[PDB]
DNA sequence: CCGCACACCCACACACCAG
DNA sequence: CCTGGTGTGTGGGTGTGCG
């Protein structure tokens, strides 16, 4: 065991500000351990999380390519607005928006009738698919808070698990689906 | 005779492939 | 990228034990 010096703490803080989107990873801290060998990713993360976070105060803004924003002379831009992290959580709204989209899909499939009006394209369920061609690709485009892969897995692992109708009755009856799924996150010496 | 340093946990968002 | 099987490591912590 080794104590964290003020110098090291300020180094950890600086690194997180220049890599804000990685603030909640483990890998960021494992990399930091390369420069401050007396410590490990685990101790650095914990040190940051529990002790140093109250001192972050600001991070530097990054662009859409994950890179830092630099000006004419190469200076950075401070911000109290954290950028999006690596993973985005699903919201109840999102779950409902997905379930409904799938329900409408199955409705059109089975009845060849428009769910909104009743126009001829010429309820409940307990079927998995098949899922229409490019359904998730287009769902992602229209709702880009998650990628096509994220939406698809959310449908497979959570929606199909909880049940489309069940979730729709639940949401409307008023939140997100949950807990329907070497040990990772252990970057030791 | 306890606070810090460090280990470890785990559901799961997001990913990729083969058949 | 149709489905299923399955990998990766984040995100948010908790468990442990040294000095």
Residues A75, A143, single domain; the answer is no
Residues A100, A171, single domain; the answer is yes
Closest amino acid to nucleotide C8 (CA–C1'):
A184
State the nucleotide closest to A178 in CA–C1' terms. Answer: B11
Residues A97, A80, single domain; the answer is no
Q: Residue A137 CA to nucleotide C19 C1', Å?
A: 56
Residues A24, A78, single domain; the answer is yes
Q: Residue A184 CA to nucleotide C8 C1', Å?
A: 9
Rounded to whole angstroms, the Cα distance separating A174 from A152 reads: 26
Footprint of strand C on the protein (CB under 7 A): A 1, 22-27, 42, 45-46, 49, 85-87, 89, 128-137, 148, 153, 156, 184-185
Residues A53, A134, single domain; the answer is no
Q: Residue A55 CA to nucleotide B10 C1', Å?
A: 28
Residues A98, A79, single domain; the answer is no
CA distances from A52 to A7, A46, A123, A171 (A): 12, 9, 53, 39
Resolution of the entry in angstroms:
2.2
DSSP string, A101-143: HHHHHHHHHHH-B-SSS--B---------PPPTTHHHHHHHHT
Residues A40, A56, single domain; the answer is yes
Residues A29, A105, single domain; the answer is no
Method of determination used here:
X-ray
State the nucleotide closest to A140 in CA–C1' terms. Answer: B14
Burial degree of A83 (CB within 10 A; 0-12, 13-18, 19+): middle
- The domain that holds A21 is classified in CATH as 1.10.10.60
Q: In which domain, by residue range, is A25 found?
A: 2-87+181-189
What is the tally of structural domains in chain A? 2
Residue A111, both tokens: 């009845």
What crossing angle do the helices spanning A164-172 and A92-111 adopt, rounded to 10°? 130
Q: H or E segment at A162? A: helix A160-162
Residues A9, A19, single domain; the answer is yes
Residues A62, A20, single domain; the answer is yes
CA distances from A183 to A22, A69, A138 (A): 20, 35, 35
Asked if residue A50 lies in contact with residue A67, where contact means CB atoms within 8 angstroms, the answer is: no
Q: Residue A183 CA to nucleotide C14 C1', Å?
A: 14
* Residue A113 main-chain phi, psi, to 5 deg: -135, 140
Q: Residue A181 CA to nucleotide C9 C1', Å?
A: 16
Residues A147, A122, single domain; the answer is yes
Q: Which of A180, A147, A138 is nearest to A163 (CA)?
A: A180
Residues A27, A94, single domain; the answer is no
State the nucleotide closest to A86 in CA–C1' terms. Answer: C10
């Amino acid at each position: 065991k080794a104590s964290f010096t003020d110098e090291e703490d300020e180094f950890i803080l600086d690194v997180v500000r220049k890599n804000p989107t990685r603030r909640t990873t483990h890998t960021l801290y494992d990399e930091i351990s390369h420069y401050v060998p007396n410590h490990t990713g685990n101790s650095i993360r914990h040190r940051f999380r529990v002790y140093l976070s109250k001192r972050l105060e600001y991070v530097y803004e990054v662009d859409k390519f994950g890179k830092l924003v630099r000006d004419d002379d190469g200076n950075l831009i401070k911000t109290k607005v954290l950028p999006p992290s690596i993973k985005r959580k699903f919201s109840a709204d999102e779950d409902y928006t997905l379930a409904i989209a799938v329900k409408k899909q199955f409705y059109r499939d089975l009845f060849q009738i428009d769910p909104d009006t009743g126009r001829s394209l010429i309820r409940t369920q307990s079927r998995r698919g098949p899922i229409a061609r490019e359904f998730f690709k287009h769902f992602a485009e229209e709702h880009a808070a998650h990628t096509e892969n994220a939406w698809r897995d959310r449908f497979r692992k959570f929606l199909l698990a909880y049940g489309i109708d069940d979730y729709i009755s639940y949401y409307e009856a008023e939140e997100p689906m949950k807990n329907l799924t070497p040990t990772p996150g252990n970057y030791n010496s």
